[PDB]
């Protein structure tokens, strides 16, 4: 490593049911696992002097407690809250409480689904939102975080 | 390999011609011409021929979409204010059956409640907002992956 | 018993209707808007109706054509397409020139998304036809003739 | 001779339409429902359409006539009058027999009270005609012929 | 001397049950008792009162059609059809006879769906919650509206 | 054979003092004073002592209801515009627990949609609207029957 | 052991069950369902009566006639579920406990079908379980009346 | 006569552990353990192996549904309060593609308006409410008929 | 020190119908009058060098005019607007116009009653709101005012 | 005179009190508030127990465990005020009276914060009065239980 | 003067007596008395006799409107908070049938959503908001033009 | 005491306002928009205001004229007519050039259909005038002068 940049510490958070990625009818719904996505993203981040940490959980409390633990340690969050996007005021208040900028990512286009999925407790306080672009959305959020923090 | 050339059209709606003009020290210095020149160069390196129209005239955007029929493989559109108001743009994109991604420089969800409604988001392949000029580059990268299966 | 007075009728078509007959003709149909308007103009001519037509993707062209109709045109048939749901300016142009009109849609607007159930013209139209394809323009013409000649 | 296949068409009229032509004929109009249906039956006969008709104030009579149309009728023209806004039972009868239909209203429902802007039939109709008076039934007949003969 | 008024009273579904269930708790007066007393009150003022109660929407619609050019005024308690029947509204609009809407119970004190009437905006007026006497008040109102008294 | 005397209070809200004043040939000639004089005489024949207040002052109506506690048997109220706006009048009538009938001269359901809401109708014994001045007489007759069980 | 009298009421269009494209939409008729249900009821000393009608008034008048004769009602009001306050008021007026049954899942259909004028006053509601829903309602009624 | 064994999972949401505890003489005496013991015995007589989880922890219900994938034939679920709030449970049941019936002991339509909405009812095979504990037995009988075509 | 000892002037405002407290069916609804509550509260305030003034009125104008008269004289307001909570924009604009901090108090739990009572034209601009704790709510508002003004 | 057992429950994110920009947003931690409140309660023969959690299940299970042990609950559900029907049903299920407390004025924030699944079944609600709100709820509970 | 004299009534609602009092260096120094003195002088130059009432008492505004009947040609009203709440004021102005203009110092559309509703705007000849004290002068000029056909 | 700095003010008029003075002049009035703007330009000139004007039925011409006003125009008076209710693009043009504006309507928008009660400009306007006819432009001019010169 010969990095001239200040290191960024970035946390990726994944919400409920995303552990199932790649393991129902892979020929129909797609083959990539969450582990595959995060391994590729961690490698992409490391080339740009970004240290990437990750948690996926079906437990709302684990996501809230990981956000609390990020206070004064993490520079940026990428979050795919999955179903909790629509329901969790507690996650909104955790992110407001630690004051870390974040990007919201969804694999699927939330606006093309049921009307209840059009509402997010996070989108109005996110720096931005990516939906419908599949796993590449995490890479775009990483690229955006680097640009937003380094002013590039 | 050698890849098949992709023809991609970028459409920008009203007021985006003002980019880089107002309080440049506060709101930013990049013009739309700067963004599109850089995006055109990025596309050319990946065998994508990128065409562009920005207009304050809804009819110019509709007619450009009509002209894309059987010629263009993918659209990137930032409809700006027309996102919230133009059923005619929705029906133009449905009429020519070209896949598209919707891009906004600013986070539409962080602004007035009327900006939370889009006539395009439910038929878009995807939507990017709040990531500034880089959002066009992300949409380009997404389109290439969607068309080449990469 | 007497020869009829000529009716001057204007047909206005809104955005995207220029695409009729182009996309997947084997699936969605082969008739172009030019084919529809040629047939309609011939039907009108046999009943002493002089039929004029404009299709445009430019809202201003439709507004200006309505302004130009003042004291010249007896009746309007309008398919505003997407502008049905969005254009107060077209409503106000039609109110401003005081010409009776019928609203026509090729497709059934009530069978589509909920935003298409609202029209800024339907409450001030003499009536509305939807879902009957190109024949809807012929029905509007027949209605206009009956409304003006009391037949 | 007729070289066409005969079409069997049923016209259904809902409540209060029996009053047509009765109240202040000099003000509101003189044509009765019987006059409208006699003229429509003659028009249909010229195009090898056999037209049957029921008007009723009884929701059950309309439902049972729809049930009886199964595998006998090719097309329905219905003016449900007030039942347009209230009858899920009529919607489910028409869904149950799977015969295509056109909805007709004499008056422009969009120009009246807001409760009249909702129909339990318009989203499943082939199309809807409103505000064109008695001629709306003729237009629906012409549409049915075109839809069934692909003309 | 007065000119005779012809008045029709229409009663909607379920009002035939009045006086039947737990009479010691919910009340003992039948609809037949109410209409006999109202007919006698009408007769004293040279009003010929006719009546139909039905559970059949079509019987009410057809009775309204039959009233055209025969009946001067209608008193109607549409019961549940108040909230649901556009057909009854259109029957009364179609024959153009003035009417008063009557409810025995206070419709505003019950479920929210009962707050909406398809008749109240075109009625001459509305009485609710005053029990059987509401029909007598509607009769007195009709006589005043027609005789200017 | 004497009845027990009933004490009944009639309350009239704002603007009802204008009755009979504007275009009498078009809108009608009877004043509120005419209506209340006739109603007081009707009540007196049935051993009802009828008291009356009309006011444009919400506080005068509220204070008159407070003063009715343990003195008045029944209230007839036409709150006029306050029907739609005054929770304070609802809470005064709930506070003194005297039964009341709500009366309107005009049909409130035939006017603007905001007039369809009453802060009193759900707690009234009943409601009369659209029957003109006779509505107060009907409310009086109902009160007498409700109190005397006739 | 003490006989129960139970009335099953079926609303409009349910006479079409089993008629249209039987290979696609199913073969069982309403008559088949009611014959089987009547036999199931008879084994438990329940006398089961039935009316299906497209006529709202026939359903209302059958409920009126049930007063002081019928112990329990099973009702599938079909389209009238969403529209008939008169049926609600008939069932409130005769004070007989009832269960609401739908063959299809009303919550999986158009949003107007999510509203019932009966569900809040029913003892309970069954939907989406096909013809077996009437048998479950019968078993529930027997348990509710015999305290079993 | 031979049947293939069915594996059925019953899921119970929050607060249902309280059943039978408060004022048994007033609210009823049966515990959730009593209901599940009886239901497990009923299932065993029809060659159904019935497994059960009740939890106040949303994650335990989600993880149990994930674990059911390719192992369980049918789910009976009473999500209790989570019926009205949990999109995550809806998405778990969509993700594992096992047919399910929704059961409530009480009539949800007779209670507050917020209880009228379910995140599960539109994707359930069917819904039973208001029939008390017997609703689980009806859901079991329905599941057997739906899987064995009887 | 001295800042802890300076006299506070506090105004209590009570809206319509609160003059009825203690009058109707005292065995059922309770016996305490508004005069009883205000006498006890005035004595509680006097022990902490708080001069407590009171107006109850059924007249909206009297409450508005009392608020106007409070300008530059009164340090804090405790208000129970009763029915006016739900209806009076004029009271909101009087309190905004004189810029005196206030607490909103209700004896009964407004959230347990009709849905129209769930809206207040004052709650969003109040320092805070107390409901459902009966007459003690006025004492809590007094204690809060003293803490807010004396920084204790 | 008879000892009262009172439980204080605090919902998610309240562990952050006093941490972020203490010079701007305030310095008092939840531990400071609860230590002072426990001492206040002890002077009046109230045994005060406390749980703060980010875990909805821990709050629900603590309410279940309060049945027939606890006389009164003071709860600040924080974000769960607006979302948790499960907490409402736990408190209804154990039938212990409670007061709802918020440090901040919920009515001064976003419109979604104006709705509480607890306020209509609480004995009362305090908001916007900072840490003193817990002390007022304690004073109210003592008065309500001792008839003082 | 060659013109017919116009009699105009200016009505000001609650809290407008506070104009000029709080933080004059920040919010402005002009009192309502200053505004009305200047407006009265402007009116007198055009043969307009101006009467004025400001009140925090709804009844005083209602009674002043009643007293205007057949005496006043035009009303200018700033109802302040009563714009949003008073049906009684609407019904007073309908009852006396004098044309009026509604004036607000501040832009009501830029404030809370409850201020976007007026019980007077739909029956006013016109509305002025956000132009400060000059709005009363514009309403006076409009009234003169509307009555004199100039 | 000091001579005033010249103000540059732009007046923008939306669709259909070109019809002013044309339809039923005996009923709706005889004044044309050209008459109104000539009088307003003269009024402005006496107070050292240079007044420029555009009326258009073309939304793009209004947007482009707003863009051209950047760093040249001190204040805008706009009557967007039907575009008041529909054009987010005009809102974003005015926000993008940061010029203060007043919204004017000849008619009382609050006395018409309920859709006219919503404006995409009123919340960001310095103020709004409606229902005062052509004099509303003069009042907006007087307000702009006071707002810019602190008079």
In sequence order, the β-bridge partners of residue H75 are: H9, H100
Residue of C nearest to L116 (CA): C88
Report residue K26 as tokens. Answer: 């920040």
Among F63, F69, F97, select the one facing I58 at the smallest CB separation: F63
The tokens describing K121, both together, are 């705007």
Cα dist from K147 to B66, D145, G102, K5, K142, whole Å? 55, 62, 68, 10, 9
List Cα–Cα distances, J138 to A80, H50, I78, J37, J42, in angstroms: 41, 47, 21, 8, 11
The SS3 call for residue F103 is: strand
Dist. CA D134–CA D132, nearest whole Å = 7
**Which residues of A define the annotated binding site for substrate?**
80, 86, 93, 107-108, 117
3-state secondary structure of H9: strand
Rounded Cα gap, residues C125 and C119, in angstroms: 10
- D92 assigned binding-site residue: yes
**Number of alpha carbons in the 13 Å side-chain half-sphere of residue H136:** 24
Ordered alpha helix ranges (H), chain B? 24-27, 32-44, 58-68, 87-96, 134-148
- Annotation-wise, does B67 bind a ligand? no
Give the angle subtended at the CA of K96 by the CAs of K92 and K98, to the nearest 5°. Answer: 110
Q: Evaluate whether E121 touches E91 at the Cβ level (below 8 Å).
A: no
Measured CA to CA, the distance from residue D81 to residue D104 in angstroms comes to: 9
* Relative orientation angle of helices D135-149 and D33-46, to the nearest 10 degrees: 30
List, in sequence order, the alpha helices (H) in chain E. Answer: 23-26, 31-44, 57-67, 86-95, 133-147
Q: Which residues contact J143 (CB under 8 A, 6 or more apart)?
A: I136
Q: L63 to chain B: which residues are within 8 Å by CB?
A: 14-15, 56
Structure tokens at I85: 């909570």
Bridge partner residues of J72 (DSSP) = J6
Task: Measure CA K82 to chain center.
Answer: 12
Q: Report CB contact under 8 Å: A136, B134.
A: no
Contact C83, C14 (CB under 8 A): yes
Among D110, D132, D146, the residue with its CB nearest the CB of C122 is D110
Identify the H or E element spanning H46. Answer: none
Which DSSP symbol is given to L92? H
CA-nearest of B81, B24, B32, B130 to L92 is B81
Q: Which residues of H touch J (CB under 8 A)?
A: 13-15, 17-18, 21-22, 55-58, 80-82, 84-85, 114-115
Distance CA L61, CA C63 (A): 14
d(CA I121, CA I112): 18
How far apart CA G45 and CA G142 sit, in angstroms, is: 10
Closest residue in K to I84 (Cα) is K85
Exposure string for E49-79, b = 16+ CB within 10 A, e = fewer: bbbbbbbbbbbbbbbbbebeeebbbbbbbbb
Q: Say which DSSP state G10 is in.
A: E
J126, I123: Cβ pair inside 8 Å?
no
Q: How far apart are CA H78 and CA J60, in angstroms?
A: 17
Question: What's phi and psi for E78, nearest 5 deg?
Answer: -75, -5
Q: Among partner residues L70, L86, L89, which is closest to B14 by beta-carbon distance?
A: L89
H109 classed as catalytic: no
Total of domains in chain H = 1
Residue from J57, J63, J86, J89 to probe the interface with H (highest H Cβ count within 10 Å): J86
Of residues A11, A2, A102, the one with CA closest to residue A50: A11
> Would you state the structure tokens that stand for residue K46, as one six-digit string?
């055009």
CA F47 to chain centre: 19
Query: Are J119 and I112 in contact (CB < 8 Å)?
Result: yes
> Which chain L residue has its CA at the smallest distance from C119's CA?
L115
Distances (CA, A) of H54 to H21, H36, H134, J85, J130: 16, 10, 17, 17, 38
Q: Which of I54, I106, I121, I138 is catalytic?
A: I106
3-state helix vs strand vs coil in chain D, percent to 5: 45, 20, 35
DSSP B6: E
For residue D85, what are its two tokens?
A: 């806004």
- Is A24 close to H91, i.e. CB distance below 8 A? no
Asked if L129 and L136 count as a contact pair (C-beta separation under 8 A), the reply is yes
The C-alpha atoms of residue L82 and residue C92 are separated, in whole angstroms, by: 7
L91, L127, L144, L148: best mutation site toward chain K, by most K Cβ within 10 Å? Answer: L127
Cβ pairs B/C, distance under 8 A: 48
CB contact under 8 A, L127 and K129: yes
I3/J13 Cα distance (integer angstroms): 34
Tell me which chain C residues have a C-beta less than 8 angstroms from the C-beta of D139.
129, 132, 135, 139, 142-143
In whole angstroms, what is the distance from residue L68 CA to residue B141 CA?
A: 35
Closest CA to A57 of H60, K93, L24, E73: H60
Q: For residues C68 and C12, is the Cβ–Cβ distance under 8 A?
A: no
For residue D57, give both structure tokens. 């104030």
Strands, E, within chain G: which ranges?
Answer: 4-10, 46-52, 72-76, 98-102, 124-127
Residues of F in contact with E109 (CB under 8 A): 121-124
Q: Which helix (H) or strand (E) holds C82?
A: none
Method of elucidation: X-ray
Regarding chains K and I, contact by 3 or more CB pairs under 8 A is answered as yes
Tokens for B19, please give them: 């980019």
Contacts of B134 in chain A (CB under 8 A): 140, 143-144, 147
Q: How far apart are CA C53 and CA C38, in angstroms?
A: 10
* Runs of H (alpha helix) within K31-81: 32-45, 58-68
| Residue J7 host element (H or E) | strand J4-10
Q: In what order do the strands lie in the sheet with L75-79?
A: K48-54, K6-12, K74-78, K100-104, K126-129, L127-130, L101-105, L75-79, L7-13, L49-55
The domain spanning residue L33 has which CATH number? 3.40.50.9100
CA–CA distance, K143 with K147 (Å, rounded to integer): 6
CA separation for the pair C62, G108 (Å, rounded): 43
| Selection from H120, H8, H1 nearest residue H53 by Cα | H8
| Rounded CA separation K62/K66 (Å) | 6
Cα A54 to Cα A70: distance, rounded to the nearest angstrom: 11
Of L89, L98, L120, the CB nearest to B15: L89
CA E41 to chain centre: 15
Q: How far apart are CA D31 and CA D33, in angstroms?
A: 7
Task: Name chain G contacts of E56, Cβ cutoff 8 Å.
Answer: 57
Segments forming the whole domain that contains residue J74:
1-148
Strands (E) across H33-123 are located at 48-54, 74-78, 100-104
- Whether residue H116 is annotated as binding a ligand: the answer is no
What element of type H or E holds J22? Answer: helix J22-25
L127 contacts: CB under 8 Å, gap ≥ 6: K107, K128, K129, K130, K131, K135, L102, L103, L143
Q: Please tell me which of the candidates G15, G53, G82 has its beta carbon nearest to residue D88.
A: G82
Q: Which residues of F touch E141 (CB under 8 A)?
A: 131, 134, 138
- B146-to-A135, B49, F146, J73, L145 alpha-carbon distances in Å: 12, 16, 78, 56, 57
Helix runs in chain D, H state only: 25-28, 33-46, 59-69, 88-97, 135-149
- E10 backbone dihedrals φ, ψ, rounded to 5°: -120, 135
Q: C11-38: string of b/e by CB count within 10 Å (b at 16+)?
A: bbbbbbbbbbeeeeeeeeeeebbeebbe
Measured between beta carbons, the chain J residues lying within 8 angstroms of A98 are: 16, 20
L137 is catalytic: no
Angstrom distance (rounded) from CA E86 to CA D15: 10
Instruction: Kindly state the helix (H) or strand (E) to which residue G67 belongs, with its residue range.
Output: none
Residue G116 among known ligand-binding residues: no
Residue G148 to chain H, least CA–CA distance (Å):
10
Chain G positions touching chain D (beta carbons under 8 Å): 11-13, 15-16, 19-20, 53-56, 78-80, 82-83, 112-113
- Sorted by sequence, the CB contacts under 8 Å of residue F91 that are 6+ apart come out as I16, I17, I82, I83
Helices (H), D16-127: 25-28, 33-46, 59-69, 88-97
Backbone φ, ψ for residue J93 (5° rounding): -70, -35
Show Cβ contacts of residue K79 under 8 Å, excluding neighbours closer than 6 positions.
K11, K13, K61, K86, K89, K102, K118, K120
J89 is in an annotated binding site: yes
Residue I64: list chain K partners with CB under 8 A: 14-15, 56
**Across chain H, where does the E strand assignment appear?**
6-12, 48-54, 74-78, 100-104, 126-129
Tokens of B108: 């539409």
Of D60, D88, D91, the CB nearest to G54: D60
Q: What backbone torsions phi and psi does residue H108 show, to the nearest 5 degrees?
A: -60, -25
Residues C22, C26: Cα–Cα separation, whole Å: 10
Residue K147: count other Cβ atoms within 10 Å of its Cβ. Answer: 16
Instruction: Give the closest residue to H73 by CA, choosing from H142, H130, H127, H131.
Output: H142
- Residue B77 DSSP SS3: strand
Distance, in Å, from the CA atom of L82 to the CA atom of C86, rounded to the nearest integer, reads 11
Q: How many CB atoms within 10 Å of residue H88?
A: 26
In this structure, are strands H74-78 and I102-106 parallel, antiparallel, or unpaired? unpaired
Q: Quick one: tokens of E121?
A: 């905006």
Neighbours of L47 (CB within 10 A): 17
Q: Across L18-119, where does the E strand assignment appear?
A: 49-55, 75-79, 101-105
CA distance G28 to chain E (A): 31
Q: What is the DSSP letter of E85?
A: -
Q: CA A41, A42, A43, A46 torsion: positive or negative?
A: positive
Task: Please state, as a whole number, how many other Cβ atoms lie within 10 Å of the Cβ of residue C42.
Answer: 10
Structure tokens, K76: 């200018």
Nearest to H110 among G99, G107, G120 (CB): G120
* Helix or strand run (H / E) with residue C78: strand C75-79
Q: In angstroms, what is the resolution?
A: 1.6
Q: Is G116 within 8 Å of H138 when comparing Cβ atoms?
A: no
Residues facing residue G52 across a β-bridge: G10
- Cα angle vertex G102, ends G96, G104, to 5°? 175
């Amino acid at each position: 490593g010969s990095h001239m940049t200040q290191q960024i510490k970035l946390l990726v958070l994944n919400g409920p049911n995303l552990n199932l990625l790649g393991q129902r009818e892979p020929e129909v719904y797609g083959s990539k696992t969450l582990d595959d996505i995060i391994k590729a993203l961690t490698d992409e981040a490391a080339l740009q002097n970004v240290a990437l940490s990750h948690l996926q959980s079906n437990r709302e409390y684990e996501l809230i407690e990981k956000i609390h633990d990020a206070f004064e340690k993490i520079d940026f969050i990428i979050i795919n809250p999955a179903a909790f996007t629509h329901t969790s005021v507690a996650l909104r208040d955790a992110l407001l409480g630690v004051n870390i900028p974040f990007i919201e990512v969804h694999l699927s286009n939330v606006h093309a689904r049921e009307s209840f999925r059009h509402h997010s407790y996070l989108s109005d306080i996110a720096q931005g939102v990516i939906c419908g672009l599949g796993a590449k959305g995490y890479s775009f959020a990483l690229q955006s975080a680097i640009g937003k923090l380094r002013n590039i």
